[PDB]
């Protein structure tokens with residue numbers, strides 16, 4: 251049974267649109283891509299061809315379609331539906347306790363380590379657009395990573411690097427220093443993993459702000475909210491990250507809580523200007539497994 | 543809104559290493575569904591990437607409808623959905639059907655038209671495209687007497703080709719792989735072989751040749767790469783032109799055209815546009 255009913259639009263933007271739909275009497279998410287982003291549709295389809303990509307902390311794929319009549323093309327991605335929405339949405343209007351905060355960030359680390367580590371199969375995969383809008387919240391309190399349209403793949407056994415053909419760049423707010431100054435080593439797989447680690451540190455910060463300690467919590471803010479304009483440009487971000495050497499500020503109330511003190515240390519080890527100094531996804535996962 | 547995606551698979555019309563092709567039904571309309579083997583996933587990816595780049599629409603190109611990827615328990619299912627041509631492939635059609643001058647020219651001019659449309663870069667448009675596996679099994683016959691070219695799984699924009707149809711520069715590995723015109727010239731060679739296959743089935747003075755594939759008299763079934771290289775490259779053989787063609791003005795013109803698709807020197811071969819013009823001036 252292949253038919254789908256589109257029920258409500260849950261998101262519209264430059265990307266296209268996402269719909270809540272019904273398939274075999276279950277909710278599914280249906281992304282209809284803008285023609286401006288056709289290369290993301292194709293790349294995401296190449297990524298989801300891999301059966302061993304499937305993981306509790308990666309958005310689950312159902313189908314991909316390109317349809318056309320005459321000069322009109324539609325591009326469809328059908329996935330699992332997570333009615334709690336993105337982590338960005340969720341953090342707006344919920345605070346976290348220690349257990350929920352660590353469950354969320356460990357789940358994202360688990361997904362990211364699963365992407366980064368090759369299975370001998372699933373290639374090693376770097377995401378390149380990790381951010382809180384690209385993470386969905388699940389009813390079990392874990393998250394899953396979404397949007398593989400910019401991903402890079404690498405196979406150690408065959409010495410193959412597949413950077414794809416997509417002139418899309420990452421979300422400007424979350425771009426690492428080497429992306430903003432354009433010195434990133436483009437033929438080095440490890441360079442792309444290190445860009446994900448930078449962005450992961452920013453997502454850690456966004457989440458940890460929302461964890462209560464000693465009756466105090468910060469309001470939700472996106473990374474660099476205090477130092478760049480609304481709707482920051484590439485150059486706006488380059489100014490603060492590369493010229494001003496800014497990193498998100500650690501609220502001093504974190505240092506009274508052992509969990510938030512450990513998390514502050516971890517996010518600082520994602521933010522070194524030297525990409526090779528940054529922690530690996532596996533190391534972040536192991537550290538978060540040990541933190542309580 | 544309801545998005546009807548069910549396709550009823552009715553009849554298998556082809557099965558090989560590539561996978562299978564089915565006649566199917568969508569919303570009361572015949573469609574063709576190619577189900578890819580795991581062996582041939584890259585052909586689905588290449589054709590899909592091409593149609594994501596340029597939505598080709600031409601009467602002599604098999605009409606695209608959809609590329610479908612579906613997650614299964616243990617595998618990925620890849621379908622290509624196209625227009626359905628109930629008369630089947632040119633290879634199939636030539637087995638029992640004979641042709642007259644009008645029907646022979648209409649078939650070969652339609653193929654040349656499709657091939658020139660692939661080859662030409664159009665600005666503001668489409669990239670230039672080489673097919674890389676042109677043969678009579680990759681051409682479908684329409685009810686209006688024209689054909690269309692199918693299978694862009696090996697196509698290149700600006701798996702190896704079927705060995706029987708490989709040009710000499712492919713067999714001797716001299717092809718200039720960094721020159722896009724090289725790939726057009728490989729398609730022209732293959733076109734010339736298809737033109738020979740069709741012309742044999744055109745009746746003149748009560749005579750027709752039986753259907754045979756190119757080089758049937760000099761290589762085995764499923765000829766090896768070496769088998770082909772020795773015939774095409776070392777001995778420089780070309781398909782036989784029967785004497786009876788030289789009594790018929792159409793087959794005389796078609797023999798000359800074939801000759802100028804089969805030059806050893808790829809740059810000496812006719813272009814698809816020049817073949818069209820020559821075909822329009824026959825009869």
Ligand SMILES: COc1cc(-c2cncc(-c3ccc(C4CCN(C)CC4)cc3)c2C)cc(OC)c1OC
Nearest residue numbers: 316317318319320322323568569571573606607608
């Ligand atoms: C994939 O294939 C087939 C698809 C369809 C089909 C079904 N619903 C809607 C549509 C459609 C409507 C409207 C637009 C445009 C109109 C102008 N502007 C506003 C942009 C949008 C595009 C598309 C189609 C084409 C029918 C088919 O057959 C009759 C197909 O062929 C098998």
Ligand SMILES: COc1cc(-c2cncc(-c3ccc(C4CCN(C)CC4)cc3)c2C)cc(OC)c1OC
Nearest residue numbers: 260268279280281329331332335336339384396397
């Ligand atoms: C990031 O990327 C993709 C995401 C999804 C996806 C999957 N489940 C649920 C959602 C969702 C549902 C609901 C809300 C909100 C909307 C309004 N308010 C805030 C309450 C509810 C937000 C989000 C989405 C967006 C699907 C995709 O593809 C099909 C994605 O692309 C890969």
Ligand SMILES: COc1cc(-c2cncc(-c3ccc(C4CCN(C)CC4)cc3)c2C)cc(OC)c1OC
Nearest residue numbers: 315317324326544545546547568607608609610623
């Ligand atoms: C996803 O998968 C398949 C889909 C279809 C199919 C079925 N009904 C309707 C459609 C349709 C077309 C176009 C629009 C347009 C309307 C104009 N608007 C401004 C933008 C969107 C909406 C809907 C499609 C594409 C057929 C399939 O097989 C033949 C599919 O599977 C490959």
Ligand SMILES: COc1cc(-c2cncc(-c3ccc(C4CCN(C)CC4)cc3)c2C)cc(OC)c1OC
Nearest residue numbers: 555563574575576622624626627630631680692693
């Ligand atoms: C070359 O390649 C592709 C071909 C096709 C395709 C399209 N229409 C019709 C056909 C077909 C139908 C019917 C017969 C037979 C059956 C009944 N009769 C008694 C004899 C004739 C043969 C052939 C095909 C095989 C689709 C493809 O993709 C979906 C192809 O791949 C690109």
